[PDB]
């Protein structure tokens with residue numbers, strides 16, 4: 001049998017053209033080969049797999065016939081609530097809208113607690129021997145992805161509470177013996193297909209909302225209302241309200257590492273304001289704000305695309321793939337000199353003549369949330385280093401003290417940061433590897449964590465985040481690991497040995513799940529899955545990225561139809577075109593620590609990396 005038995009049914013229903021693409025990708029997959037071939041073939045594989053996913057793995061949630069009529073030329077800026085982007089759909093990507101799906105839901109209402117979330121958290125997730133990424137990915141990279149993810153997606157909660165209790169078998173090992181939390185809000189779609197959906201309370205667009213705000217009350221209170229600028233402290237750190245909450249884009253459940261990135265991008269936005277005002281002296285505060293928001297949001301997307309993701313997926317094929325999405329396969333030189341040439345492959349997703357949503361209204365999806373659950377990236381302790389110290393024996397800035405990262409989280413974390421300062425915090429994060437996405441690497445401070453309200457204030461009910469994450473994936477009807485793979489046209493595991501070569505992992509998984517591979521939780525599978533050389537993430541998670549990372553550029557009017565000098569200003573567009581990574585942004589505002597200590601090409605590498 002040519003095709004895997006579990007994929008024969010879908011194969012039989014494919015069009016001739018899809019059959020060809022599927023057989024091509026499946027030929028590599030059966031032999032685990034896509035990542036083991038030269039770049040050009042790897043890219044052909046990825047584009048072919050992407051096309052298939054775009055056809056089979058974009059599902060609308062809620063009615064797609066959103067009528068609300070408007071002229072795109074009336075909205076040549078990124079709106080505060082994310083409305084008025086898609087010319088055919090005023091609601092697409094705005095706050096308080098349904099998460100879409102990449103796969104048909106799997107009802108787990110009778111198995112929400114099977115196996116027990118505390119057991120999973122305690123036996124499979126809880127950090128044992130600490131594992132890091134070596135030189136590949138530092139703590140700035142861990143902060144970056146939260147700065148992205150806690151901004152991109154936040155599920156609307158039910159006002160009521162439920163609680164779960166640690167079972168006898170693991171209670172003595174649980175930092176919390178029970179905890180309360182709010183269920184995810186279920187809302188009827190009133191539609192033909194999927195009946196129930198959940199709401200994203202953030203915008204789905206690349207719009208820098210981590211810095212610009214979610215809401216009409218801080219979105220305003222973040223602005224100086226002079227020269228388009230945003231509010232920042234004299235130490236280069238965020239200002240704070242009397243209740244201790246940071247004055248930035250309403251990122252709840254944050255830590256000091258995210259706060260310094262918000263602060264850095266506030267300065268970036270303000271510097272963009274200065275540059276545009278110099279070119280166009282007569283612009284109002286509102287005009288400058290709008291242009292600078294366009295510029296800064298694009299800088300953030302660009303840094304994520306061709307710097308962050310490139311270090312996350314540290315292979316030649318992936319450097320080429322991500323750069324192709326942004327610049328096109330014809331490359332930066334041609335793109336910058338002549339503009340977008342050809343279609344999405346040759347010229348890239350950025351600069352396409354028109355946005356393309358592939359027939360399905362733009363949204364972030366339930367599965368995009370699940371594959372971005374990367375809490376194990378946070379190390380247990382931070383080595384604080386001296387920005388003007390004598391180089392140590394390793395030629396690093398010398399260590400001053402170890403700090404428990406638990407002390408750097410949330411409101412108390414904002415306090416500690418105000419005593420540390422930007423340079424020390426940033427340098428220290430730059431010189432330390434982040435945690436690896438593997439089993440037994442989930443920080444203890446997450447297992448008795450104070451969660452926050454929407455307004456950023458502390459809730460009185462601590463949570464075991466690891467237990468809750470496992471619960472959330474089930475609660476939200478996201479398929480479990482093996483079915484999740486099948487739905488992405490990936491070969492399922494037959495036994496635990498297919499998942500990982502770690503004997504201890506196998507034995508521990510067997511003790512909890514038995515030999516039922518269909519029971520394995522998604523999060524557990526994503527962490528345990530044997531990794532591609534250079535990949536910080538599982539191949540399973542990567543498959544959602546293939547689809548969704550492309551989509552977030554291609555579906556956006558401001559990265560396509562309106563990615564031009566007229567919309568951004570000439571100086572604004574040049575600012576985007578000449579910024580290649582986080583290094584460039586840090587260098588703009590902190591050239592001193594950059595010159596002295598940032599030796600690696602990417603600011604996301606541990607800063608003494610030899611490349």
Ligand code: HEM
Pocket residue numbers: 142143145146149150153154155181253254255369370372373374375377378409410449450451452465468472
């Ligand atoms: C110390 C830093 C962090 C803290 C304190 C923290 C805490 C939290 C909390 C309390 C939640 C909500 C749990 C719930 O009610 O369902 C959450 C959600 C989430 N976090 Fe984190 N987190 C941190 C870092 C990260 C990192 C590094 C990532 C990696 C991208 C990440 C990704 C996510 C995702 C995908 C969700 C689910 C969002 C949703 O349900 O819409 N977080 N986090």
Ligand SMILES: CCCCCCCCCCO[C@@H]1O[C@H](CO)[C@@H](O[C@H]2O[C@H](CO)[C@@H](O)[C@H](O)[C@H]2O)[C@H](O)[C@H]1O
Pocket residue numbers: 012013014015016017
């Ligand atoms: C370069 C020159 C190009 C030559 C022309 C190519 C034309 C082929 C395009 C469509 O291919 C067909 O698509 C059908 C589906 O759209 C398939 O039906 C399959 O799937 C259907 C539904 O998914 C089922 O109802 C059918 O029974 C089942 O045969 C069918 O097999 C397949 O051949």
Ligand SMILES: [Ca+2]
Pocket residue numbers: 151152202203204205206207208209210
């Ligand atoms: Ca946003």
Ligand SMILES: [Cl-]
Pocket residue numbers: 323327331332333
């Ligand atoms: Cl290039």
Ligand SMILES: [Cl-]
Pocket residue numbers: 342343344345346347
């Ligand atoms: Cl093309």
Ligand SMILES: [Cl-]
Pocket residue numbers: 545548549
């Ligand atoms: Cl992404």
Ligand SMILES: [Cl-]
Pocket residue numbers: 576577578
């Ligand atoms: Cl560019």
Ligand code: NA
Pocket residue numbers: 497498499
């Ligand atoms: Na395998």
Ligand code: NA
Pocket residue numbers: 601
């Ligand atoms: Na270099």
